[PDB]
Design a protein around this ligand. Structure first.
Ligand code: 9BJ
Ligand code: ZN
Length: 342
């Protein structure tokens, strides 16, 4: 695939620019209102908007939004669950604003989520309609907004992330150090329970928006790379393939985060900006796909922050599904990607 062809596909996808402001206005208004009203509670006093992009996490999809509400929870004691390395029980090390959500010694996620959804449903009452881990809203019978509650911890990152975030040869060890000083998050998610999974969406956004070895990367004509284009192309490939086979539960468990993680690993493999030259968009992309296929074939896709947490384990995704996706992707690459046609 020629780089200009790929960029033609991407530019063809960018045709939603005029609508972006119109949607962002309404969504921004509703979300801000929900924040204003939601701040009134004692438990959700320090609630806030994490704002990690505020754009779409799905390309092809201008109607679906994803927002995340952070809550400062000072002095927390995490307890690892069954060596899952990613899922934890939240404890407290007396006066606790979240004491009402305590089911014994462990902070209950279901009750807190219930109070959350209850307040939000109390505020939508006064053309927004709530739908039956996340809380989905429907603005103007068109726009979908996924709201996620996340606990914020300004403590040092858990031990399972010690050997994660290998960006030393890419973005330098200095940046890794300053990044690991930032807080980490916890989203309500069960393991394959009342457990919480680690989340570093802010870090992902940060490394994506500051992706070059050079500080001036993508700031001048001579230093424009094709990292973001590769990520977008991968995401679009997976999205189109999932769209073609929506009638099957094979590709249901495959999503953009797998693609993003694989992309991050590829970035680690190719730390130099010269390895992501603009004119080489065709090759770089071809690399990414290949690596992704490897992750499908070897059934190994380590979380970029939690190396011992495998996203492509047999327990999470069965071999058959990965083989099917492999077949489809390989066909696509072998036939100049006909799935990008429209
Ligand atoms: O921060 C992250 C995000 C994703 N992952 C892994 O993929 C996780 O295994 C993901 C891999 C797919 O994730 P997703 O973003 O594509 O899609 C999510 C997400 O859309 C929704 N969800 C989950 C939590 C939440 O608080 N609010 C939500 O709406 O259920 C989907 C499936 O999530 P899983 O646990 O079923 O498996 C991580 O490890 N850390
Ligand atoms: Zn760049």
């Amino acid at each position: 695939m020629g780089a200009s062809k790929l960029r033609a596909v991407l530019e063809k996808l960018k045709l939603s620019r005029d609508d972006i402001s119109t949607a962002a206005g309404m969504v921004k208004g509703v979300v801000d209102h929900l924040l204003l009203r939601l701040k009134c509670d004692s438990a959700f006093r320090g609630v806030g908007l994490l704002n990690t992009g505020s754009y779409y996490e799905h390309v092809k999809a201008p109607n679906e939004f994803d927002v995340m509400f952070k809550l400062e929870v000072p002095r927390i004691q995490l307890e690892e669950y069954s060596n899952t390395r990613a899922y934890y029980f939240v404890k407290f090390k007396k006066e606790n604003p979240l004491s009402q959500f305590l089911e014994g010694e462990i902070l209950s996620a279901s009750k807190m989520l219930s109070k959350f959804r209850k307040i939000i449903k109390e505020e939508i009452n006064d053309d927004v309609i709530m739908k039956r881990p996340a809380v989905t809203l429907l603005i103007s019978e068109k726009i979908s907004v996924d709201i996620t509650l996340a606990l914020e911890s300004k403590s040092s990152w858990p031990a399972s992330t010690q050997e994660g975030l290998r960006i030393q040869n890419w973005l330098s060890a200095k940046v890794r150090k300053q990044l690991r000083l930032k807080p980490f998050y916890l989203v309500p998610k069960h393991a394959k329970e009342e457990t919480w999974r680690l989340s570093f969406s802010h870090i992902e956004k940060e490394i994506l928006n500051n992706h070059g070895k050079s500080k001036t990367c993508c700031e001048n004509k001579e230093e424009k790379c094709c990292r973001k284009d590769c990520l977008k192309l991968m995401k679009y490939l997976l999205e189109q393939l999932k769209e073609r086979f929506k009638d099957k539960k094979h590709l249901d468990k495959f999503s953009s985060y797998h693609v993003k993680t694989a992309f991050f690993h590829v970035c680690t493999q190719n730390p130099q900006d010269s390895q992501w030259d603009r004119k080489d968009l065709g090759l770089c992309f071809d690399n990414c796909v290949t690596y992704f296929l490897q992750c499908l074939r070897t059934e190994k896709l380590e979380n970029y922050f939690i190396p011992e947490f495998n996203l492509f384990s047999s327990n999470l995704i069965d071999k058959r599904s990965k083989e099917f996706l492999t077949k489809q992707i390989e066909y696509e690459r072998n036939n100049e990607f006909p799935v990008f046609d429209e």
